[PDB]
Amino acid sequence: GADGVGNSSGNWHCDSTWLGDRVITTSTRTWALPTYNNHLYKQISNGTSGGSTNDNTYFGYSTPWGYFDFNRFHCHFSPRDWQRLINNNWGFRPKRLNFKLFNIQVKEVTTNEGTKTIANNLTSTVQVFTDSEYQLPYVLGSAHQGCLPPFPADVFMVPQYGYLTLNNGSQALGRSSFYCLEYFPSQMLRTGNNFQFSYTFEDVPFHSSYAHSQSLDRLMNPLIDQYLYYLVRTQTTGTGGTQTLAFSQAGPSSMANQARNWVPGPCYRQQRVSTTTNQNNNSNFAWTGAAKFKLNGRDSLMNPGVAMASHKDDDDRFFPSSGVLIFGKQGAGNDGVDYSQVLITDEEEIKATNPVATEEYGAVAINNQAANTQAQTGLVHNQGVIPGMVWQNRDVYLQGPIWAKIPHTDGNFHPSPLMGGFGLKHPPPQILIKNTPVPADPPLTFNQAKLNSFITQYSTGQVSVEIEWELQKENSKRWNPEIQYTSNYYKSTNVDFAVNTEGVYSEPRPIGTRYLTRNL
Amino acid sequence: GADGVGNSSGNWHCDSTWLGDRVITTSTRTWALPTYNNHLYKQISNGTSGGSTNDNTYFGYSTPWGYFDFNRFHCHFSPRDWQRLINNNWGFRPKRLNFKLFNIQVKEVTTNEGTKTIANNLTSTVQVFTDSEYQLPYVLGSAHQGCLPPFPADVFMVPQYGYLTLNNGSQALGRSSFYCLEYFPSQMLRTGNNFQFSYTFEDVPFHSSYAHSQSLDRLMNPLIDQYLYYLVRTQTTGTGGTQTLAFSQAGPSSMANQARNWVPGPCYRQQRVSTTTNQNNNSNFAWTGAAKFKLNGRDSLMNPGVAMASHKDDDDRFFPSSGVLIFGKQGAGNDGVDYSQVLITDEEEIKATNPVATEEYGAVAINNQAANTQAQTGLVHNQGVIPGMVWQNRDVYLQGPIWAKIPHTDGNFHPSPLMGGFGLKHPPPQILIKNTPVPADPPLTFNQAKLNSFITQYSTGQVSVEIEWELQKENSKRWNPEIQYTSNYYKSTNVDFAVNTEGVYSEPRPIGTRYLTRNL
Ligand SMILES: Nc1ncnc2c1ncn2[C@H]1C[C@H](O)[C@@H](COP(=O)(O)O)O1
Ligand SMILES: Nc1ncnc2c1ncn2[C@H]1C[C@H](O)[C@@H](COP(=O)(O)O)O1
Ligand SMILES: [Cl-]
Ligand SMILES: [Cl-]
Ligand code: NA
Ligand code: NA
């Protein structure tokens, strides 16, 4: 038969294939969908009143719908695969994908007298649809939990969909928009029924898997001397102290002086903090210290900020308070976890072209030099883009994000997601799922009221995401061995990126993308 | 319909057909699959610490998967069939096979208040796949229990899959590899869904079902005398005792002296032990006595060793402590069972070309003979292969193993499984099965955690293995009746290879392969 209950409505594909440039990832996981909001759209707001501050106010709605998110690299990549990709390519980018939902099973749970039994409702349905026109608030790219699990074996719960609208305090404005998912043409399923579609990534720039092997400043030959001169002295050396103009040709020895065609990238000052406890000043400056941007009278934290080097050499302990991504160690607590639990990423690789996060961009003269007045200079903590700058985008990690929807705005600049990734105008459409409400027996005499009693049930099934990535091979003529991600030989009680003695896959550290080195 | 619940998704084939050389075996058994490891991959290690010795240390993983093993002769052969094959062929070998899984039924068991009920989950699925590329640690050929039952009627449990990786003590090394079965493209089934495939055995040498009827030493005509001489005496006979060189032509009477073109096979000394209790020395030399090979600082027992004759004639009671296969009598206990329970196989058939297990290979001179110094000789307990050797491989039994995967190594010698069988580089692929986890109702509010609650269920179904064997008929011109496996006429209370009064099929003794005799 075509579609029956005693028939697999799809298969399990979890494979990675490398041919030439194209690497194909395929993942399958087993999901479970709870009933959300008792089949109800609820208005949710957080007020100014009460303990909560004004910066955490919001207005929105929580829907009875769940959504499928695969926006995390680890979903499509095995740790071993991530290794192959990082260690041999100068870049890569998504090309197309394929989604599938199958072997859907709906169960109805009954409880009597502390006795609980779960069996099948076959006639029951499950609704699915894609926001192919992008008419629904984009949830994804907010780094929200609920993406497919990293380990294929694990079975996961489907995230609940909800959105935010313009708000003043705990109130909404005239502008704020209320969306109803049901007002969307969605496809329905019964077990033996399957859903699926395909999408093709708009053209996007290859991510850089290469870390520079020349600093922006050191772009010139040591042996030669520039044909240009610079002002070397305003005053005669020694006792005389009489103003004079002396000019010198910037040479190899005087490298700093010599003129350059390109200058470092932009910077927003980030407060510095040291892993060692003692060094830090004894105040709770987590918030007061941190850089932030104020929008509509509300100050939001600048996380994770513009792309900047985490630390200057040998300052490894240092990190921006808010200027890097942080990943919890497995089993880590959501609130107030200790330092040991967290994995603080490090973006030092990009130090060569990008400004250090914790230091000034540089200095600019504050006044005209005078016969009486002395020259002055001021520091640059906040530096915007100017002609001649070059820079590197923030890195993605095996457990990082992949893409993000570029806001539909009149304009924007270098729209590469600040958390790292590919910026798409038309990203993979949001996939929405929901269990169709099955009413409990209605009262015998007609009632104008809307039914408030339903059979309790949840659904389960497999999901498949297959993505085709385009690689960009290395062309380096570097004579010496390059740096590469490896797993240390030395013995240990547990294996890296494996299950422990209890059956708990764990990702020991974040894994960057740039190991291979390319010239500037 | 094509695939429905009320439809047999396969039939029962249990037949043997003989045409010409080709004998075709077909078996079908009914299996049951329990849930394994609560749907969890678990890290398993045995430590140096505690009672366990260092030689029993290991590191590995236990998977939620089960595997189908047919690697035992009795599965495909009826005892009567084994008889026909052994009693009329000089050899045979596997040619191709066909596997099938069908009539899959998944049951979900419920327990309330000490009340247990088992019914059907139809929408539930079962995953299956073959390691057609050999990317998974090879379990088979380790003589592990869990192969299809010998008796067709019996219903069996499916073995759990698990593997081992490089370990130091209870720790893993950097090299050690962790495999995830789910990362394998596997096919899913619902009842009315069936799986199946075919494989063809790489070319392999016919097993020898023939026992030699000439000793390697006695390969020459009695009547004739060799045209070659040997050194018969170093000293004059009688009183004189003065050195002289005397040479004689090796004749029929002096058979031992005469030169030969071929010499016996290799040997590793095996400690001798007698079935009679009194003869044996009163010490627990089971381990201390036994020969062993030390790998990576760990001593493993040499079981079952190289192929060697169990005993010289009339030494029938004797056997190598570790140098023969042992099969438990039906109902025999796993640990510390008495001698009566066990069936100790006997490889005396091969004594003619192979060295006796318990005796030295022979002797070699230890020094140069001297006018003053006397000649000396030393025994050879360990003897490696040298030009001119010929030997017989170890026999397979009706309840023995069939093939084994030749380790993917740079080199090897005469790669015939030491436990007996056919050595294949690409053996029948491991067949992996697993019940797909069906989650218990999830909590209403999204949780980042991985689901830990599942409906309890197991599966059942029929399995079919069909193998085509190629025979090699006897060509003997032997005038007298040959020895053959028979069942003794004399009355008994139970029939050989039948069920007893309780319904317990039992294999009374091991059944060899070599009865027919061929010349050397
Ligand atoms: N990841 C990503 N997504 C979307 N747009 C991006 C991305 N990275 C850079 N850009 C911007 C930068 C330029 O404005 C343009 C490509 O020009 P070019 O001269 O090639 O830099 O796209
Ligand atoms: N059972 C089995 N499996 C695999 N390889 C085997 C087996 N028996 C012997 N051999 C080896 C011995 C030789 O190296 C080769 C066949 O050569 P020949 O001159 O025919 O002995 O194969
Ligand atoms: Cl976490
Ligand atoms: Cl047994
Ligand atoms: Na709510
Ligand atoms: Na276990």
PDB file of C-alpha atoms in Angstrom, chain A residues 199-399:
ATOM      1  CA  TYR A 199      15.213  24.610   0.206  1.00  0.00           C
ATOM      2  CA  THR A 200      18.259  26.103  -1.501  1.00  0.00           C
ATOM      3  CA  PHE A 201      20.528  28.598   0.208  1.00  0.00           C
ATOM      4  CA  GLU A 202      20.765  31.994  -1.391  1.00  0.00           C
ATOM      5  CA  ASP A 203      24.321  32.712  -2.394  1.00  0.00           C
ATOM      6  CA  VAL A 204      26.462  33.500   0.594  1.00  0.00           C
ATOM      7  CA  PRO A 205      30.209  34.110   1.203  1.00  0.00           C
ATOM      8  CA  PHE A 206      32.319  31.158   2.290  1.00  0.00           C
ATOM      9  CA  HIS A 207      33.054  31.130   5.994  1.00  0.00           C
ATOM     10  CA  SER A 208      36.718  31.600   6.768  1.00  0.00           C
ATOM     11  CA  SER A 209      38.295  28.469   8.218  1.00  0.00           C
ATOM     12  CA  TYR A 210      41.727  30.032   7.818  1.00  0.00           C
ATOM     13  CA  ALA A 211      43.654  32.031  10.397  1.00  0.00           C
ATOM     14  CA  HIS A 212      46.017  34.701   9.089  1.00  0.00           C
ATOM     15  CA  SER A 213      49.797  34.144   9.191  1.00  0.00           C
ATOM     16  CA  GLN A 214      50.853  37.814   8.858  1.00  0.00           C
ATOM     17  CA  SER A 215      49.713  40.744  11.020  1.00  0.00           C
ATOM     18  CA  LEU A 216      48.045  43.671   9.283  1.00  0.00           C
ATOM     19  CA  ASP A 217      50.868  45.935  10.453  1.00  0.00           C
ATOM     20  CA  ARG A 218      53.638  43.589   9.279  1.00  0.00           C
ATOM     21  CA  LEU A 219      52.727  43.542   5.576  1.00  0.00           C
ATOM     22  CA  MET A 220      56.023  44.784   4.170  1.00  0.00           C
ATOM     23  CA  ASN A 221      59.461  43.472   3.244  1.00  0.00           C
ATOM     24  CA  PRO A 222      62.066  43.716   6.001  1.00  0.00           C
ATOM     25  CA  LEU A 223      65.079  44.333   3.750  1.00  0.00           C
ATOM     26  CA  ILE A 224      63.743  47.328   1.796  1.00  0.00           C
ATOM     27  CA  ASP A 225      63.170  50.945   2.863  1.00  0.00           C
ATOM     28  CA  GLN A 226      60.101  52.983   1.893  1.00  0.00           C
ATOM     29  CA  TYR A 227      60.569  55.770  -0.634  1.00  0.00           C
ATOM     30  CA  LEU A 228      58.393  57.903   1.677  1.00  0.00           C
ATOM     31  CA  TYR A 229      59.455  59.943   4.706  1.00  0.00           C
ATOM     32  CA  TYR A 230      57.654  60.583   8.004  1.00  0.00           C
ATOM     33  CA  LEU A 231      58.080  63.337  10.592  1.00  0.00           C
ATOM     34  CA  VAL A 232      60.611  61.865  13.000  1.00  0.00           C
ATOM     35  CA  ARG A 233      61.387  64.882  15.224  1.00  0.00           C
ATOM     36  CA  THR A 234      59.776  68.182  16.263  1.00  0.00           C
ATOM     37  CA  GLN A 235      62.746  69.251  18.358  1.00  0.00           C
ATOM     38  CA  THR A 236      66.530  69.079  18.158  1.00  0.00           C
ATOM     39  CA  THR A 237      68.146  66.296  20.166  1.00  0.00           C
ATOM     40  CA  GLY A 238      70.180  67.212  23.223  1.00  0.00           C
ATOM     41  CA  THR A 239      70.425  70.427  25.211  1.00  0.00           C
ATOM     42  CA  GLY A 240      69.315  72.982  22.621  1.00  0.00           C
ATOM     43  CA  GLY A 241      65.619  72.140  22.651  1.00  0.00           C
ATOM     44  CA  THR A 242      64.814  74.303  19.635  1.00  0.00           C
ATOM     45  CA  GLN A 243      62.012  73.296  17.288  1.00  0.00           C
ATOM     46  CA  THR A 244      63.052  71.713  14.002  1.00  0.00           C
ATOM     47  CA  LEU A 245      61.552  69.472  11.341  1.00  0.00           C
ATOM     48  CA  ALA A 246      63.397  66.224  10.710  1.00  0.00           C
ATOM     49  CA  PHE A 247      62.221  63.559   8.290  1.00  0.00           C
ATOM     50  CA  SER A 248      63.278  59.937   7.927  1.00  0.00           C
ATOM     51  CA  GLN A 249      62.500  57.166   5.468  1.00  0.00           C
ATOM     52  CA  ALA A 250      60.706  54.403   7.361  1.00  0.00           C
ATOM     53  CA  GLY A 251      62.960  51.383   7.259  1.00  0.00           C
ATOM     54  CA  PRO A 252      62.969  47.759   8.370  1.00  0.00           C
ATOM     55  CA  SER A 253      64.183  48.666  11.855  1.00  0.00           C
ATOM     56  CA  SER A 254      61.626  51.438  12.210  1.00  0.00           C
ATOM     57  CA  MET A 255      58.682  49.293  11.157  1.00  0.00           C
ATOM     58  CA  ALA A 256      56.004  51.044  13.214  1.00  0.00           C
ATOM     59  CA  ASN A 257      56.613  54.413  11.559  1.00  0.00           C
ATOM     60  CA  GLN A 258      56.219  53.285   7.940  1.00  0.00           C
ATOM     61  CA  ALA A 259      53.044  54.048   5.975  1.00  0.00           C
ATOM     62  CA  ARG A 260      50.432  51.376   5.268  1.00  0.00           C
ATOM     63  CA  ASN A 261      47.562  50.923   2.818  1.00  0.00           C
ATOM     64  CA  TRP A 262      45.228  49.117   5.209  1.00  0.00           C
ATOM     65  CA  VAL A 263      44.210  49.743   8.809  1.00  0.00           C
ATOM     66  CA  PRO A 264      42.621  47.453  11.525  1.00  0.00           C
ATOM     67  CA  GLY A 265      38.907  46.760  11.827  1.00  0.00           C
ATOM     68  CA  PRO A 266      36.284  48.503  14.040  1.00  0.00           C
ATOM     69  CA  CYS A 267      35.950  48.171  17.842  1.00  0.00           C
ATOM     70  CA  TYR A 268      33.556  48.703  20.747  1.00  0.00           C
ATOM     71  CA  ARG A 269      35.385  48.679  24.049  1.00  0.00           C
ATOM     72  CA  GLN A 270      34.796  45.554  26.108  1.00  0.00           C
ATOM     73  CA  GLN A 271      35.512  45.444  29.824  1.00  0.00           C
ATOM     74  CA  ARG A 272      38.315  43.017  30.670  1.00  0.00           C
ATOM     75  CA  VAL A 273      38.038  40.190  33.203  1.00  0.00           C
ATOM     76  CA  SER A 274      40.547  37.611  34.401  1.00  0.00           C
ATOM     77  CA  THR A 275      39.931  33.916  34.945  1.00  0.00           C
ATOM     78  CA  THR A 276      42.060  34.111  38.072  1.00  0.00           C
ATOM     79  CA  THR A 277      39.868  35.423  40.892  1.00  0.00           C
ATOM     80  CA  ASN A 278      42.456  37.534  42.723  1.00  0.00           C
ATOM     81  CA  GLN A 279      43.376  39.855  39.855  1.00  0.00           C
ATOM     82  CA  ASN A 280      39.836  41.191  39.373  1.00  0.00           C
ATOM     83  CA  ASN A 281      38.671  44.261  41.303  1.00  0.00           C
ATOM     84  CA  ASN A 282      36.334  43.407  44.166  1.00  0.00           C
ATOM     85  CA  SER A 283      33.058  44.749  42.818  1.00  0.00           C
ATOM     86  CA  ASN A 284      30.050  43.299  41.016  1.00  0.00           C
ATOM     87  CA  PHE A 285      30.704  45.154  37.779  1.00  0.00           C
ATOM     88  CA  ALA A 286      29.207  42.396  35.638  1.00  0.00           C
ATOM     89  CA  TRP A 287      26.482  44.794  34.575  1.00  0.00           C
ATOM     90  CA  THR A 288      27.742  48.226  35.547  1.00  0.00           C
ATOM     91  CA  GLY A 289      31.099  47.554  33.900  1.00  0.00           C
ATOM     92  CA  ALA A 290      29.802  46.002  30.682  1.00  0.00           C
ATOM     93  CA  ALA A 291      29.308  47.909  27.425  1.00  0.00           C
ATOM     94  CA  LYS A 292      25.711  48.316  26.247  1.00  0.00           C
ATOM     95  CA  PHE A 293      23.494  49.895  23.597  1.00  0.00           C
ATOM     96  CA  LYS A 294      20.347  51.803  24.480  1.00  0.00           C
ATOM     97  CA  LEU A 295      17.295  51.310  22.280  1.00  0.00           C
ATOM     98  CA  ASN A 296      13.917  52.966  22.808  1.00  0.00           C
ATOM     99  CA  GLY A 297      14.884  54.049  26.306  1.00  0.00           C
ATOM    100  CA  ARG A 298      15.939  50.545  27.293  1.00  0.00           C
ATOM    101  CA  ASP A 299      19.565  49.497  27.750  1.00  0.00           C
ATOM    102  CA  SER A 300      20.412  46.064  26.421  1.00  0.00           C
ATOM    103  CA  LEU A 301      23.753  44.355  26.977  1.00  0.00           C
ATOM    104  CA  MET A 302      26.207  44.346  24.026  1.00  0.00           C
ATOM    105  CA  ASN A 303      26.429  40.603  23.614  1.00  0.00           C
ATOM    106  CA  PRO A 304      28.455  39.242  22.046  1.00  0.00           C
ATOM    107  CA  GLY A 305      29.577  42.513  20.491  1.00  0.00           C
ATOM    108  CA  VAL A 306      31.541  43.234  17.332  1.00  0.00           C
ATOM    109  CA  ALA A 307      34.212  40.767  16.305  1.00  0.00           C
ATOM    110  CA  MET A 308      37.434  41.498  18.220  1.00  0.00           C
ATOM    111  CA  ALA A 309      40.441  39.555  19.480  1.00  0.00           C
ATOM    112  CA  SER A 310      39.752  38.093  22.915  1.00  0.00           C
ATOM    113  CA  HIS A 311      43.288  38.820  24.142  1.00  0.00           C
ATOM    114  CA  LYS A 312      46.728  40.089  23.144  1.00  0.00           C
ATOM    115  CA  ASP A 313      49.419  37.414  23.283  1.00  0.00           C
ATOM    116  CA  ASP A 314      50.029  35.753  26.657  1.00  0.00           C
ATOM    117  CA  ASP A 315      46.858  37.302  28.081  1.00  0.00           C
ATOM    118  CA  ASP A 316      45.078  33.983  27.625  1.00  0.00           C
ATOM    119  CA  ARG A 317      43.337  34.179  30.991  1.00  0.00           C
ATOM    120  CA  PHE A 318      41.632  37.427  29.921  1.00  0.00           C
ATOM    121  CA  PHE A 319      38.256  37.586  28.137  1.00  0.00           C
ATOM    122  CA  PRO A 320      35.619  40.228  27.449  1.00  0.00           C
ATOM    123  CA  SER A 321      32.878  40.162  30.049  1.00  0.00           C
ATOM    124  CA  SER A 322      30.310  39.979  27.269  1.00  0.00           C
ATOM    125  CA  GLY A 323      32.457  39.774  24.162  1.00  0.00           C
ATOM    126  CA  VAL A 324      32.738  36.051  23.458  1.00  0.00           C
ATOM    127  CA  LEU A 325      30.369  33.107  23.174  1.00  0.00           C
ATOM    128  CA  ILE A 326      30.064  30.875  26.225  1.00  0.00           C
ATOM    129  CA  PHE A 327      29.055  27.220  26.229  1.00  0.00           C
ATOM    130  CA  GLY A 328      28.096  25.326  29.360  1.00  0.00           C
ATOM    131  CA  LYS A 329      29.818  22.066  30.209  1.00  0.00           C
ATOM    132  CA  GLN A 330      27.397  19.171  29.962  1.00  0.00           C
ATOM    133  CA  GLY A 331      25.064  18.966  32.940  1.00  0.00           C
ATOM    134  CA  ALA A 332      25.825  22.595  33.733  1.00  0.00           C
ATOM    135  CA  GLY A 333      23.224  24.562  35.672  1.00  0.00           C
ATOM    136  CA  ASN A 334      21.237  27.331  34.004  1.00  0.00           C
ATOM    137  CA  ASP A 335      21.655  29.896  36.788  1.00  0.00           C
ATOM    138  CA  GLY A 336      24.777  31.107  38.580  1.00  0.00           C
ATOM    139  CA  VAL A 337      26.990  28.215  37.545  1.00  0.00           C
ATOM    140  CA  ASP A 338      30.647  28.132  38.551  1.00  0.00           C
ATOM    141  CA  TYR A 339      33.455  28.961  36.125  1.00  0.00           C
ATOM    142  CA  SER A 340      34.502  25.332  35.793  1.00  0.00           C
ATOM    143  CA  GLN A 341      31.184  24.364  34.205  1.00  0.00           C
ATOM    144  CA  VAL A 342      31.437  26.951  31.402  1.00  0.00           C
ATOM    145  CA  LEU A 343      33.541  26.776  28.231  1.00  0.00           C
ATOM    146  CA  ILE A 344      34.603  30.285  27.278  1.00  0.00           C
ATOM    147  CA  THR A 345      35.424  30.443  23.562  1.00  0.00           C
ATOM    148  CA  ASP A 346      38.506  32.270  22.359  1.00  0.00           C
ATOM    149  CA  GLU A 347      38.716  34.490  19.288  1.00  0.00           C
ATOM    150  CA  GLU A 348      42.411  35.289  19.420  1.00  0.00           C
ATOM    151  CA  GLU A 349      42.958  33.780  15.981  1.00  0.00           C
ATOM    152  CA  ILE A 350      41.662  37.018  14.441  1.00  0.00           C
ATOM    153  CA  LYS A 351      43.933  39.288  16.473  1.00  0.00           C
ATOM    154  CA  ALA A 352      46.131  40.026  13.458  1.00  0.00           C
ATOM    155  CA  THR A 353      43.507  42.072  11.589  1.00  0.00           C
ATOM    156  CA  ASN A 354      41.055  42.885  14.372  1.00  0.00           C
ATOM    157  CA  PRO A 355      41.511  45.166  17.430  1.00  0.00           C
ATOM    158  CA  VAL A 356      41.981  43.659  20.866  1.00  0.00           C
ATOM    159  CA  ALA A 357      38.641  43.628  22.675  1.00  0.00           C
ATOM    160  CA  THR A 358      39.918  45.067  25.951  1.00  0.00           C
ATOM    161  CA  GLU A 359      42.204  47.796  24.584  1.00  0.00           C
ATOM    162  CA  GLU A 360      41.725  51.131  22.831  1.00  0.00           C
ATOM    163  CA  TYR A 361      41.692  51.253  19.047  1.00  0.00           C
ATOM    164  CA  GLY A 362      44.398  53.857  19.264  1.00  0.00           C
ATOM    165  CA  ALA A 363      44.778  57.615  19.678  1.00  0.00           C
ATOM    166  CA  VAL A 364      43.779  60.872  17.986  1.00  0.00           C
ATOM    167  CA  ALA A 365      44.989  64.443  18.508  1.00  0.00           C
ATOM    168  CA  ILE A 366      42.620  66.565  20.599  1.00  0.00           C
ATOM    169  CA  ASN A 367      43.943  70.044  19.752  1.00  0.00           C
ATOM    170  CA  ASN A 368      46.141  72.040  17.400  1.00  0.00           C
ATOM    171  CA  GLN A 369      49.774  72.216  18.489  1.00  0.00           C
ATOM    172  CA  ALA A 370      50.769  75.748  19.441  1.00  0.00           C
ATOM    173  CA  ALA A 371      53.832  77.884  20.057  1.00  0.00           C
ATOM    174  CA  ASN A 372      52.568  78.038  23.616  1.00  0.00           C
ATOM    175  CA  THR A 373      50.133  75.074  23.647  1.00  0.00           C
ATOM    176  CA  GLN A 374      51.348  71.497  23.854  1.00  0.00           C
ATOM    177  CA  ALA A 375      50.210  68.680  21.611  1.00  0.00           C
ATOM    178  CA  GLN A 376      47.546  66.382  23.035  1.00  0.00           C
ATOM    179  CA  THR A 377      45.975  63.049  22.216  1.00  0.00           C
ATOM    180  CA  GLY A 378      42.912  61.149  23.362  1.00  0.00           C
ATOM    181  CA  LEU A 379      42.138  57.450  23.401  1.00  0.00           C
ATOM    182  CA  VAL A 380      39.694  55.772  21.025  1.00  0.00           C
ATOM    183  CA  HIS A 381      37.460  53.307  22.881  1.00  0.00           C
ATOM    184  CA  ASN A 382      34.665  53.370  20.365  1.00  0.00           C
ATOM    185  CA  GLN A 383      35.742  53.186  16.721  1.00  0.00           C
ATOM    186  CA  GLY A 384      33.443  53.019  13.706  1.00  0.00           C
ATOM    187  CA  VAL A 385      34.207  51.833  10.165  1.00  0.00           C
ATOM    188  CA  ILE A 386      36.310  54.022   7.857  1.00  0.00           C
ATOM    189  CA  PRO A 387      37.785  53.609   4.338  1.00  0.00           C
ATOM    190  CA  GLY A 388      40.739  51.235   4.307  1.00  0.00           C
ATOM    191  CA  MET A 389      39.693  48.909   7.123  1.00  0.00           C
ATOM    192  CA  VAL A 390      39.774  45.121   6.756  1.00  0.00           C
ATOM    193  CA  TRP A 391      38.622  42.567   9.318  1.00  0.00           C
ATOM    194  CA  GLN A 392      37.631  39.025  10.125  1.00  0.00           C
ATOM    195  CA  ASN A 393      34.154  37.792  11.032  1.00  0.00           C
ATOM    196  CA  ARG A 394      33.535  35.875  14.267  1.00  0.00           C
ATOM    197  CA  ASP A 395      34.062  32.098  14.161  1.00  0.00           C
ATOM    198  CA  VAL A 396      31.474  29.294  14.296  1.00  0.00           C
ATOM    199  CA  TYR A 397      31.852  26.268  16.507  1.00  0.00           C
ATOM    200  CA  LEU A 398      30.911  22.610  16.295  1.00  0.00           C
ATOM    201  CA  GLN A 399      28.199  23.533  18.806  1.00  0.00           C
TER     202      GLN A 399
END
